[PDB]
Amino acid sequence: AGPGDVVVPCHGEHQAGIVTPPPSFIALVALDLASTSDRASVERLLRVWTVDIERLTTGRPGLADSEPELALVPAALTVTVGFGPGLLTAAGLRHRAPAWLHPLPPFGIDRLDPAWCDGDVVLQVCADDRTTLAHAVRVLTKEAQGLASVRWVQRGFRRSPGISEPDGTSMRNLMGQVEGTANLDPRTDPDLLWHRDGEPGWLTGGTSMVVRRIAMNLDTWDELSRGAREATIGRTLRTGAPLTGRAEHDEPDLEALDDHGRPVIDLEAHIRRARPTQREETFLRRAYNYDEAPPPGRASDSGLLFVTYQRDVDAQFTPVQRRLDAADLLNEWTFPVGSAVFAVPGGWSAGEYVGQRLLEG
Amino acid sequence: AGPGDVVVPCHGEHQAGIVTPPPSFIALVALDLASTSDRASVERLLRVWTVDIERLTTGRPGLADSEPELALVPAALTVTVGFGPGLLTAAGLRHRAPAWLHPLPPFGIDRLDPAWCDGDVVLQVCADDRTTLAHAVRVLTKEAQGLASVRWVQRGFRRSPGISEPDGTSMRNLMGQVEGTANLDPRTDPDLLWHRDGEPGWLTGGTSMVVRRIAMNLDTWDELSRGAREATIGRTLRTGAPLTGRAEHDEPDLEALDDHGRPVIDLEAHIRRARPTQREETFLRRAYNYDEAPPPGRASDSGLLFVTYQRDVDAQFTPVQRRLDAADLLNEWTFPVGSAVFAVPGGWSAGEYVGQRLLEG
Ligand code: HEM
Ligand code: HEM
């Protein structure tokens, strides 16, 4: 009857937690395989995780679960499994690596901290309840004991269940902006998200995942007028409308000039520079806010858990990231501190296990 | 109407966020005053914070608030202000310090990390939404820039709004236990929470606040059977009933023996050792779960944000803490890593400011 009772099916053509409507909370858990790891280790790990995913997501305790009462409220729990290149190396499956399974190239804007970078495998754990999420993470982490150890955990949030943004907007970030308006529609453009026919065959129903941890300099952001902040993005903070429109969902008019013949939306405005240049230069953004205990001598450690899904990182994401590196006003108040690329297996049915089509050989 | 629309009044005989039903999220922000601080600094700080509290809690932007749209959803926001000894020192008011305003005495069980200890002032910021909380914390922190800097921030959680525990229980902690059953009732025993007539006069309507950051060794806790975990506390994990009863709210029978003449609830069981020995040896527990990104070698960094409120720390809390130090089975799987004591001013009305009765002189 309430948001705690919601079960999201973990079985299908695709893994859940990608086109699944984003719930309130996320923990991205990157793990590194043990030095002893081989194909058999990786297989066992994926198989024990499959059991725990099928149980936890239906509000049943996991296999390595000593706190069953912490499992009984599923709260729309999803776990999405992604493989880093090191997993394929350790399994002896380099020959099955897609061309795009590698770190993003370096960019001038990068301030990458290796402790927020890479990972042999990732669990994107999402739920509408923080206790449910804490439990799921504890169970999945324990299950991997001796097979993989935690490399990093990035925690993020949106509004709570039953709490919609001011004026029913998509998501508010900690810069105070509306985020998610002009996203990839996987109902119209499924071929730009989902791997179908191509090589390698094990990625059928699967995708690629990018995680950029992008810090917001809120201290310098505070030095900008409202007008300068809106010019930076090309959309208003109140409604989330383009500078040229009245409502959130109005099409930005990138041809529109002011009385002096200057573009209304700046030549270096985020949404101009980030816009698709070709059909394929788009991706499913599925971002979350992060807000940490601040470091010595600062008020805040806030930013964006920028998670994107696309068929091919190199063809779809990287050309956009490369265009923003070259020019984007937003780069003056944001900086990437973490980068990770993962291959996401397709879904599975009762009796299968996640990544099975890969570990066949 | 939804949980986002809820306004908790910040005006009354007492500060809100103490007897206010606990909402989903908490951030305790400890700040340290600058060395150059004086009575005028402290007064200004409390006055600018009073404005921000009155605004943010009613879903209006703060004074130093450049992200107003992040303020529009109050989500039951409360801010509770506590003063550490250093605030009274800095204001030239040591002579107004109650006898109990000092760090707790040291205990054998203490593993206190100075970075989680003390603070000249604390903001307990509570809300049913994490974006609302992140915003409030950002506004209050910015407002103190040049008067006080952040010392630590402890973040915690319960279940999300509209999400109740399995079988309508009080709160589940990350040991999987029911927490909050045998708490101080301030409706029956208000004199054990609230300072009324006594010296010092400025604490009328006020209280004392203890924050213990208590780490859970979940790795060693996992080595215990269900029976051993229940024996440790003296209550069952499923229902939260005493070992001697059937339901959560049954009175524990501490005289009850098994067929072998052993006490049914262990002599060193948490709820036996923690029970009041005298009427005054009780306090309002208002605890939250903490779950951090784990340190390099470990699966989890989980524990309890143990926040308590009482008229007098020395008379009420410390004798209980001292009895648990002497013997408690739970001490084998928990350890305190942070300790802070604060004096909590009484409430205020439209046109007053928090702590005004102190800064009079
Ligand atoms: C802190 C970092 C960032 C912030 C605060 C941010 C914020 C925003 C905002 C406010 C919008 C407009 C609303 C929307 O359509 O979602 C937007 C759009 C977009 N952003 Fe970002 N963004 C950030 C980083 C990135 C990065 C690194 C990329 C890299 C590819 C990216 C790609 C996009 C794209 C493609 C759009 C849609 C543009 C359109 O077609 O109108 N963003 N972002
Ligand atoms: C991680 C640390 C701790 C855990 C997991 C924990 C857990 C619990 C649990 C499960 C209960 C039984 C349910 C209830 O009545 O609340 C309880 C009761 C209690 N705890 Fe703790 N506790 C911890 C630390 C402390 C500390 C440091 C104190 C310090 C004074 C304390 C004081 C109490 C009191 C007074 C009760 C009620 C006892 C009664 O009258 O039946 N606890 N705690």
Residue numbers in the entry:
A (entry chain B), B (entry chain A): 23 to 383
Q: What's the paper's own text on this?
A:
DyP-type peroxidases (DyPs) are heme-containing enzymes known for their ability to degrade dyes through their peroxidase activity. Based on sequence features, the family of DyPs can be dissected into four subfamilies (class A, B, C, and D DyPs), according to the Peroxibase classification. In this paper we identify another type A DyP from the alkaliphilic cellulomonad, Cellulomonas bogoriensis (CboDyP).
The crystal structure of C. bogoriensis dye-decolorizing peroxidase (CboDyp) was determined to 2.4 Å resolution. The model contains eight protein molecules in the asymmetric unit (molecules A–H). Like other enzymes of this class, CboDyp is a homodimer. The monomer has a characteristic Dyp-type peroxidase fold containing two domains with both a ferredoxin-like fold, consisting of two four-stranded antiparallel β-sheets packed against each other. The porphyrin ring of the heme cofactor is buried in a hydrophobic pocket packed between the β-strands of the N-terminal domain and two α-helices. The heme cofactor is ligated by the strictly conserved proximal His292 with a distance of 2.1 Å between Nε of the imidazole ring and the heme iron. A glutamate residue at that position is different from all other DyP peroxidases so far known which all contain an aspartate. Hence the dimensions of the distal cavity near the heme-Fe have been reduced.
